[PDB]
Structures are given as structure tokens and as C-alpha cells.
Design a protein around this ligand. Structure first.
Ligand SMILES: CCCCCCCCCCCCCCCC(=O)O
Ligand SMILES: CCCCCCCCCCCCCCCC(=O)O
Lengths: 129, 129
């Protein structure tokens, strides 16, 4: 129903391979790979505000599902894409050659980002306030 | 008693003035000045692990109070300093020309950094888990 909340990263798979493939500087990969930070989502209907801790960067994006949005990626590049709702608990988007699926299951969020043969997967858990 | 917790930034003063004074690019200042993120402290006796959300950057430092440690600053520079514990609720250190005081009262942390005539103050509140 609602994605809103604060989520702490629990585990992730293939961070280094994915970050190398998108061209992140090696120095930012090494300092960011072991950080387990907190991301915050604010949902108002179809409108989303994301404050994402990804490695050693904080990225803030907003968008409305189904509307074209301009989004900052991990490299700082801005991309124009549309985020779709699949079901009621999955956000799905494509940009460049990446497919991103954000799936909510109770207190667990799983983000899966596929780039060619690399699947970068983040599992986070809702902070219970 | 214990600093351990996740702390969400509530308010801050002189973020822009401090970041300009230490040489951060205006681009990074504008990106980060409105972010109200979560920082995490883990205390075990004299040992502290910090995961700090500072603007658009996440910085992860670790130190034992009273021992010289290398700490990453906002500029990416690693400084060697000693942090001391004053009482049970104040962390005090000085590096370059900055004095930093981190004070815990109840569930509120007040961080005050003084650089010349600029007092950079951050007020953050413990997330009640
Ligand atoms: C679509 C690009 C957004 C920014 C790219 C950063 C790479 C990681 C994105 C994961 C954010 C998904 C939100 C769930 C919480 C989390 O995993 O932090
Ligand atoms: C002294 C090394 C750290 C350098 C980073 C400076 C940016 C502000 C640091 C304040 C963190 C203090 C912990 C309380 C929580 C917070 O304010 O995020």
C-alpha cells in the first residue's frame, strides 16, 4: 500500500561489479562498498520522494509514477524516464540499459538492478519508530 | 551514557557558510544543504563507529577516544587527531583550525563546529527504535 518509511540496508550483492560497469570511479567504489546507510521514501499517492544512501553518496529524486521524470543516477548524470507501478508493491523503470525493480514486502524492500549479466541486489529493512 | 543510535537531522545553522569556508564546491553545497538525513553512531566503551550523512556525502569514521586516529573530513582530507570524551556525553576534538564538540542530552545530539567566526551547528534527534 505505502512505500513511505526509513529503510536500513541489510545486504547487497554485486555492488562492485555494477558500479564498475556504470563507470563509477574506483576510489568511490572502495569507500562506498561497506557502507550500510539509511534511505527514506515519502509517498503521496503516485508521487514519490526518495533520499537514497548509495555507497558514499546521497541522492535525492522525485517523481510521479506514469509521468516523465528527470532523475539523478549514481554517476551524477540526469536521465529522463518513466517509473511504472507493477501491481501495488513494485516500482519498475528502465533507463539507459538498466532495469530497476523496487519491491516492497511488508518491512523489507528489495531493489534489483539488472545491467546485462549483472544483477545488483539491495535488501533493506524498515526502521520501526 | 551511550551515544549509540540512529539520529535524524532536525535543523542546522551555517551549513553553507562553513562548507564554503573549508573549500567545498558551490555545486556540492547547493546539492546537500537541504538534505536531512540519518547518521548512525555505535559506541562500545571508548570505541566509536560513525556513519555520518553530511549533505550529499556519507562519511564513515572509526576511533577510540584518547588514541590518535585518522579521520576523513568533508574535503576528503584525512586528518590525524585525538577525540576526547568529556564526562559521559561530550566528544571534543580539534583538527586544522576547527573545534568540534558533540554533545548528547537525552535523545538530542548537538554538534557545534567552530571555524573562525563561523559556528556550524547541527541538531539531531535519536530515532526511537
Ligand atoms: C534509478 C537510479 C537512482 C539512484 C541510483 C542509486 C543506486 C541504488 C538505488 C537503490 C534505491 C532504491 C530504494 C530502496 C532503498 C535502498 O536500497 O537504499
Ligand atoms: C571530524 C570528522 C567529521 C567531519 C564531517 C563534518 C560534518 C558534520 C559532522 C557532524 C556529525 C556529528 C554526529 C551527530 C549526527 C549528525 O549531526 O549527523
Amino acid at each position: 500500500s505505502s512505500f513511505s518509511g526509513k529503510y536500513q540496508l541489510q545486504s547487497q550483492e554485486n555492488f562492485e561489479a555494477f558500479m564498475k560497469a556504470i563507470g563509477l570511479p574506483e576510489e568511490l567504489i572502495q569507500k562506498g562498498k561497506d557502507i550500510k546507510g539509511v534511505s527514506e521514501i515519502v509517498q503521496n499517492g503516485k508521487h514519490f520522494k526518495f533520499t537514497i544512501t548509495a555507497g558514499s553518496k546521497v541522492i535525492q529524486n522525485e517523481f510521479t509514477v506514469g509521468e516523465e521524470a528527470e532523475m539523478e543516477t549514481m554517476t551524477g548524470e540526469k536521465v529522463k524516464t518513466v517509473v511504472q507501478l507493477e501491481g501495488d508493491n513494485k516500482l519498475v523503470t528502465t533507463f539507459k540499459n538498466i532495469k530497476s525493480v523496487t519491491e516492497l514486502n511488508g518491512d523489507i524492500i528489495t531493489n534489483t538492478m539488472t545491467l546485462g549479466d549483472i544483477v545488483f541486489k539491495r535488501i533493506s529493512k524498515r526502521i520501526l519508530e
